[PDB]
Design a protein around this ligand. Structure first.
Ligand SMILES: Nc1ncnc2c1ncn2[C@@H]1O[C@@H](COP(=O)(O)OP(=O)(O)NP(=O)(O)O)[C@H](O)[C@H]1O
Ligand SMILES: Nc1ncnc2c1ncn2[C@@H]1O[C@H](COP(=O)(O)OP(=O)(O)NP(=O)(O)O)[C@@H](O)[C@H]1O
Ligand SMILES: Nc1ncnc2c1ncn2[C@@H]1O[C@H](COP(=O)(O)OP(=O)(O)NP(=O)(O)O)[C@@H](O)[C@H]1O
Ligand SMILES: [Mg+2]
Ligand SMILES: [Mg+2]
Ligand SMILES: [Mg+2]
Lengths: 466, 54, 480, 255, 310, 128
């Protein structure tokens, strides 16, 4: 039926229905603007009024103004007639290529895969990125998390993965841009048309795009994470297919939450966040998963505010991943890209029974010398290298090489590194370190291992200097 | 020679060691204050918060 | 008698007037007060309407008349604003008549979507050796200028504005750039000098100065950068090019925090509101580069952020860093030492704008980025002691005085001088003497060579050998 | 679920060796039936591969004759992701231990009061085994996530917030639950309920409201520490900082 | 017209008015007391009620007490008759030397010079002190931070400054003691007499004194700088002088704010300060400047909480 | 009283931190706006009213004197905390005492570097 706006503040609006009253989650439809202004019920305040989160600007609304119930959730296009199309948070298309004629629809909200549907299929997914492979490998159909503070190189890394992975990949990929840079989208689009994962000519397109960037209202950023969610969901279930879900940046989802939780009228929780940060997340999060039916390999970039890895946002999210890659400004500032913290990135499959105890052994051997170097880090800073015992003078030099040989010039920042984009296969990864560790190379300069491919390019470099 | 080139040597290593020390100090004093302000606020935010909730 | 296009004030307290009336008034509609003061419907609650006041809320007595205007909050935009100083509502405060504005824009527009856009390709030239060579910006891009207090942040914007004279007094229209300086929270004394200085460089003529200074009500400062952003969209949206400078966003965030806290909203990190990231993300998205479908115009943005004790990982610095397409980091140390512009070349970055660099520069530039690179750690055998010498010199070359933007070729010239190592046997104290002579020399006499390097957009094989001879003999002529 | 814990008389000094089969624990911080020993540590330190390695140890006793050495296991899983709860059951099953082991699971997507309640429910189930003369080992994994949940309910219920936003009784919460593990005295069954609560710290901060509360409650604890971990000391324990407030009173005279 | 006390919590008073309503910032003068208890209007509350902060203790007010709106903000005497005198935050002379006999008064609150009134020139106000003028020269109409506590010359560096800017320019000076200790305030008085810059005989006195001492309430300490400011403004604006404004000490000016602001119970900002912090400071610091007519240059002592410049 | 009758008194406020606490309590239960450490906005005004009441009356007023030694307990030596800050601010000297001094042997344990009296020499006999 019909009801009216009685309160408006930011993205929170209060509608009064005399007849009937929409379930919590029903997309409402504002009647009176040149622009589809979906509200979304989130509360029943009583006195036959509901409280809703907008999905766009609310300049203009007035106390009065009619609203129609849609009788349903926000529902969007799903199916194969999405591949190649850019769609926004409510399904509307935004690549200015007409409408998205599609058989079926789905709602953005949805209960999550019951326990019986889970699958324990753990098979390694090689990236050709030395640190990731050697120390905390990604797992096929696993949840992956990229943690980073402003500017440490999440977006680059997600891109390199999209390249070393979703280019030679028989199967559908969905990319949800949640509250990041609009120009990064324009950039993706073009980059994927040229490379031809998207094709304007055909229906040979292998990717769907869902975008709600850092210029749109809380509501929109709040939700869009789920739009793109729903899409990937279909390709998994009604297609029992291999889905690749990339999000950037999942943080902006919790953030946007925070912006609204204030006026929804919850009482503030730790650090000002919404009371409901763990579940708000966890519902949404647990839908992103590989089930018996289909299979989603997820890769989410996670922003870390003020570099605070304990900020509730990043802090809570860790629970939800199977492999994590954590980026430190500290490292990046030493020109060690990709900026991966070797002692803080982990995978739930670094396990000899899964990766074969040559892998597991060279790993924890690097991970050891590094964390041995790291302990000396203090005495070296106050007294200097010389006060270091002879044994220890080495543990440094070797470690420092490892430190340097985990750097790897990506095929993207061929522009910042200038250097040619390498991709190193698990074998030569595992090998090279093993050698470095067994000190075949204590005769080579440090630099020799900074920014290279296999260990050859290392020993090779060392010559061109001499 | 050796103990002129050793006296002179450690006169220098010490000079250095203490300069390093002195920077650590400044850099550390710095986070101290950041931590300091932070704590003041975090406590005041917890008060204000539970006080609004009455 | 009227209660629908009208209200009188219930309470005027912590800078929110609660009005009674204004039934039809809409979210974000500029209302108006008896005083002449303007305000903003922000809160639409059942019985009352919450109005943000855009001025001094002492004047707002209880029970004052409040008329609607049906206008969503908006400022005057258009060519008419150039040359003028205006408050954040657009009123002229420069005493030079009134502004015959003809158009209007909502201060609160959304930003161009994924489609109406396209990769930054064209140069935005600061005319500052260091920036233009090692942190090239490009029209349509957002570059953050961030450093401690008094490190040269503003000077950088000011020079960049002053530089655009050489293009606006030019015959080529695709190279013209219109300038918009927004003063958020600064001393009024300072805006005023800033303005006079611009006026002496004959740069004011292509410039809009929007001032919400330290004594202005918080919402004014909260507003300004958006008012200004609108003014500069007009140029982006009619196939022209603008550059907007926000000086500074740190102070705006502060203003916004006042409002947030006063309205009893919930504090977090540093007592900022949860939406202080949105506050900035939505202002800085409104700058970008349009595909030719919409006139290929552009808004470029240089927002300023004031770090405290060099902490570029506070809340507000990381927010803004995570918005912009890179940043020029200024370092109090370097500044002190005398390295000015005090740019941390190793920390400073431009992402997108890498590809908007002129080719002429790129040659000599790229090979500086590289030697300065191998200088930074090596900072002893022939070559490593060489790599130093070369370094301390290239550094000296990039020191540059205030109020003197350089023509891009004048730049490529004096850089050429150092990357081919004619500077190597000069003691460094003398390097800047040399530079100033050498540059003013080629400029006076060899307008030929300069004119040509701009034209071939490249150091031509001839150009190069010509230039070789100039410098080689000039540095015999260098007596000490 | 809402059962209060055994007062003073129904009990007897903890004498019964609850073996973990982990050299580290069974020698330097030995648990005993009726004890609450906290596993605390940063994420990915090995906090769980403790509690799992321990149930997987109880095969030996549960596939035999001696009716005292037998230990039935409950395993609450609060806050985790189903993808894991499962992968974990699969791990139990494989090694063949799933048979003697309830596994109550309230996860990420489950409602708020459902995580609030989960570790209590899983307690009642273990209270039976003790109140009826048998031996239970319940493992709450983890109380950190539970607390967070209780906080949500509490805040949404408009109960004015305290430290780190948690509510006043956020201590009572873990106190009461954790008392319900006891060593019943003969006159009551001889039955036990050993409880391994699990806590997760941030950057090691054991000042955090919660981690300090739960440590004040349990009869000792094992600390984990990523530092030792990578250093080679797996299982990363930190002897010197781990205590067992029951000491040898809970070993064989062989250990 | 007349209003009434309807609540008195602490140094914050709530007052009902029947007909007119005093604007924010107006000076109400509570009736029937041995000493002038001015209230200053803080918020309009509604129901013809206003909130206020007291420029002095509130003991012994009764709800119902008659309050009389003065029809302006706080107003104080100005002009040369202030030189040598010591007035408090609301203009009363407290040097027991009778009344400050002047024609002109002025409102302590007031607005920063308009943009068009600002001089764009920067030139050095000369102190004739070698150290300063050579290496770190004071700028006409600029603010100067003055560091180091007791026994470093602070009191004398001031006096000699009051003295020279007077001598070699003809610029009177105002000293605003924000949170002056009653002891030191007495002593500073005598030292200025003993030294020259105050003269209890002739009128050759060179420095007006405004004190808002540590035992006055938040309101008074918080507004006393503005009084001092006001006094200096008369000399710039009406007599075209290059004036000196001493504020000792600016940190207490901020704190007084931060206090007053917690009393009106505005939620507190980061680290404890008012949310008004920036603009509280701005709308004072911006009155101090070079206008076309003349210039107030001001030296302000600073305390750095916790030696934390941040 | 003694002050105003030409006589000379010394008052010790042991402990001015505990008085603050009490006043805080009243302020909070009275539901008055909490500030730093939850103290009121008048917990400065509180102590400055009090301590500015010690003085030395000129001859014309008896010549009398009240002298105050307030006592502040600091926590882990934090003299930048809200109350310390305030009192240290109001008073004109500090005698800081330290535990390491105490055990090293320095008893009384007066840190003579931090300690100070702004009245100083003037309060001293010439011999001394
Ligand atoms: N390129 C330069 N060469 C030599 N001196 C410079 C240069 N740039 C700035 N300065 C000096 O440093 C200035 C400091 O202010 P400014 O240039 O506006 O940077 P800022 O970080 O914005 N300071 P502020 O506006 O107070 O935050 C002085 O007033 C100049 O004299
Ligand atoms: N993997 C890399 N290799 C070499 N240089 C890099 C790399 N990643 C980032 N950089 C440099 O540092 C910048 C940051 O890259 P980016 O991936 O965008 O960080 P980010 O995680 O996205 N932080 P933000 O996007 O602002 O939320 C680049 O634009 C480069 O100049
Ligand atoms: N004794 C061991 N030797 C070698 N590896 C081990 C050992 N114990 C645990 N690990 C590994 O270390 C990882 C972490 O173990 P886990 O029990 O999940 O610690 P946790 O702190 O509970 N992780 P989480 O639930 O995310 O907090 C695993 O994936 C194991 O395979
Ligand atoms: Mg990014
Ligand atoms: Mg500036
Ligand atoms: Mg675990």
């Amino acid at each position: 039926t019909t009801g009216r706006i009685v309160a408006v503040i930011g993205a929170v609006v209060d509608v009064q229905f005399d007849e009937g009253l929409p379930p919590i989650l029903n997309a409402l439809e504002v009647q009176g603007r040149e622009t589809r202004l979906v509200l979304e019920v989130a509360q029943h305040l009583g006195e036959s009024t509901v409280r809703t989160i907008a999905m766009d600007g609310t300049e203009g609304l007035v106390r009065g103004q009619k609203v129609l119930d849609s009788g349903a959730p926000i529902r969007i296009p799903v199916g194969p007639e999405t591949l190649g199309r850019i769609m926004n948070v409510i399904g509307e298309p935004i690549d200015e290529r007409g409408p998205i004629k599609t058989k079926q629809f789905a709602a953005i909200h949805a209960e999550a895969p019951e326990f019986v549907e889970m699958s324990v299929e753990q098979e390694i997914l090689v990236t050709g990125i030395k640190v990731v492979d050697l120390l905390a490998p990604y797992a096929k159909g696993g949840k992956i998390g990229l943690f980073g503070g402003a500017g440490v190189g999440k977006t680059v890394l997600i891109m390199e993965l999209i390249n070393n992975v979703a280019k030679a990949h028989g199967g559908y990929s969905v990319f949800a841009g949640v509250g990041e840079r609009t120009r990064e989208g324009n950039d993706l689009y073009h980059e994927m048309i040229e490379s031809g994962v998207i094709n304007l000519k055909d229906a040979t397109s292998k990717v769907a795009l869902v975008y709600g960037q850092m210029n749109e209202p809380p509501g929109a950023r709040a939700r869009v994470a789920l739009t793109g969610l729903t899409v990937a969901e279909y390709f998994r279930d009604q297609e029992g297919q291999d889905v690749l879900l990339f999000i950037d940046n999942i943080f902006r989802f919790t953030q946007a939450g925070s912006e609204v939780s204030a006026l929804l009228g919850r009482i503030p929780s730790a650090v000002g966040y919404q009371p409901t940060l763990a579940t708000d997340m966890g519902t949404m999060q647990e839908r992103i998963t590989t089930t018996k039916k289909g299979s989603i390999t997820s890769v989410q970039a996670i922003y870390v505010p003020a570099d605070d890895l304990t900020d509730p946002a990043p802090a809570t999210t860790f629970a939800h991943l199977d492999a994590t890659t954590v980026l430190s400004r500290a490292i990046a500032e030493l020109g060690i890209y990709p900026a991966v913290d070797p002692l803080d990135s982990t995978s739930r499959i670094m396990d000899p029974n899964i990766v074969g105890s040559e892998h597991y052994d060279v790993a924890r051997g690097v991970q050891k010398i590094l964390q041995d170097y790291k302990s000396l880090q203090d005495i070296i800073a106050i007294l200097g290298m010389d006060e270091l015992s002879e044994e220890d003078k080495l543990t440094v030099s070797r470690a420092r090489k490892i430190q340097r040989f985990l750097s790897q010039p990506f095929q993207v920042a061929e522009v910042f590194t200038g250097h040619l984009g390498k991709l190193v296969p698990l074998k030569e990864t595992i090998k090279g370190f093993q050698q470095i560790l067994a000190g075949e190379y204590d005769h080579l300069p440090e630099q020799a291992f900074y920014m290279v491919g296999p260990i050859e390019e290392a020993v090779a470099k060392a010559d061109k200097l001499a | 020679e050796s103990t002129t080139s050793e006296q002179s040597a450690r006169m220098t290593a010490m000079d250095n060691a203490s300069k390093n020390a002195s920077e650590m100090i400044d850099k550390l004093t710095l986070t101290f204050n950041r931590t300091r302000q932070a704590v003041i606020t975090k406590e005041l935010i917890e008060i204000i918060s539970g006080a609004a909730a009455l | 008698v009227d209660l629908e296009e009208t209200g009188r004030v219930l309470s005027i307290g912590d800078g929110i007037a609660r009005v009674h009336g204004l039934r039809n008034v809409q979210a974000e509609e500029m209302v108006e007060f008896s005083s002449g003061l303007k305000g903003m419907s922000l809160n639409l609650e059942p019985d009352n309407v919450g109005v943000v006041v855009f001025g001094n809320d002492k004047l707002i007595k209880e029970g004052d008349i409040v008329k609607r205007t049906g206008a969503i909050v908006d400022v005057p935009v258009g060519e008419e604003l150039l040359g003028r100083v205006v408050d954040a509502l657009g009123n002229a405060i420069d005493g030079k008549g009134p502004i015959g504005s003809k158009a209007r824009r909502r201060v609160g527009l959304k930003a161009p979507g994924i489609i109406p856009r396209i990769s930054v390709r064209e140069p935005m030239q600061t005319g500052i050796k260091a920036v233009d060579s090692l942190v090239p910006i490009g029209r349509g891009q957002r570059e953050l200028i961030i450093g401690d207090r008094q490190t040269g942040k503003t000077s950088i914007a000011i020079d960049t504005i002053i530089n655009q004279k050489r293009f606006n007094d030019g015959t080529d229209e695709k190279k013209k750039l219109y300038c918009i300086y927004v003063a958020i929270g600064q001393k009024r004394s300072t805006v005023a000098q800033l303005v006079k200085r611009l006026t002496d460089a004959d740069a004011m003529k292509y410039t809009i100065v929007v001032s919400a200074t330290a004594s202005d009500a918080a919402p004014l400062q909260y507003l300004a950068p958006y008012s200004g952003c609108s003014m500069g969209e007009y140029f982006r949206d009619n196939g022209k090019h603008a550059l907007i400078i926000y000086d500074d966003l740190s102070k705006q965030a502060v203003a916004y925090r006042q409002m947030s806290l006063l309205l009893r909203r919930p504090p977090g990190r540093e007592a900022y509101p949860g939406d202080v990231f949105y506050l900035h993300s939505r202002l800085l998205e409104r700058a970008a580069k349009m595909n030719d479908a919409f006139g290929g115009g552009s808004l470029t943005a240089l927002p300023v952020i004031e770090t405290q004790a060099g902490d570029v990982s506070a809340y507000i610095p990381t927010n803004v860093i995570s918005i912009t397409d890179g940043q020029i980091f200024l370092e109090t140390e370097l500044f002190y030492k005398g390295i000015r512009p005090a740019i941390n070349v190793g920390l400073s970055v431009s992402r997108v704008g890498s590809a908007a660099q002129t080719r002429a520069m790129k040659q000599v530039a790229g090979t500086m980025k590289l030697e300065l690179a191998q200088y930074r750690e090596v900072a002893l055998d022939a070559a490593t002691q060489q790599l130093l010498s070369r370094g301390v010199r290239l550094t000296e070359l990039l020191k540059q005085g205030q109020y003197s933007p350089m023509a891009i070729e004048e730049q490529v010239a004096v850089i050429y001088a150092g990357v081919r190592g004619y500077l190597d046997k000069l003691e460094p104290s003398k390097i800047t003497k040399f530079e100033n002579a050498f540059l003013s020399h080629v400029i006076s006499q060899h307008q030929a060579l300069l004119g040509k390097i701009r034209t071939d957009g490249k150091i031509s094989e001839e150009s190069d050998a010509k230039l070789k001879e100039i410098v080689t003999n000039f540095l015999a002529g260098f007596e000490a």
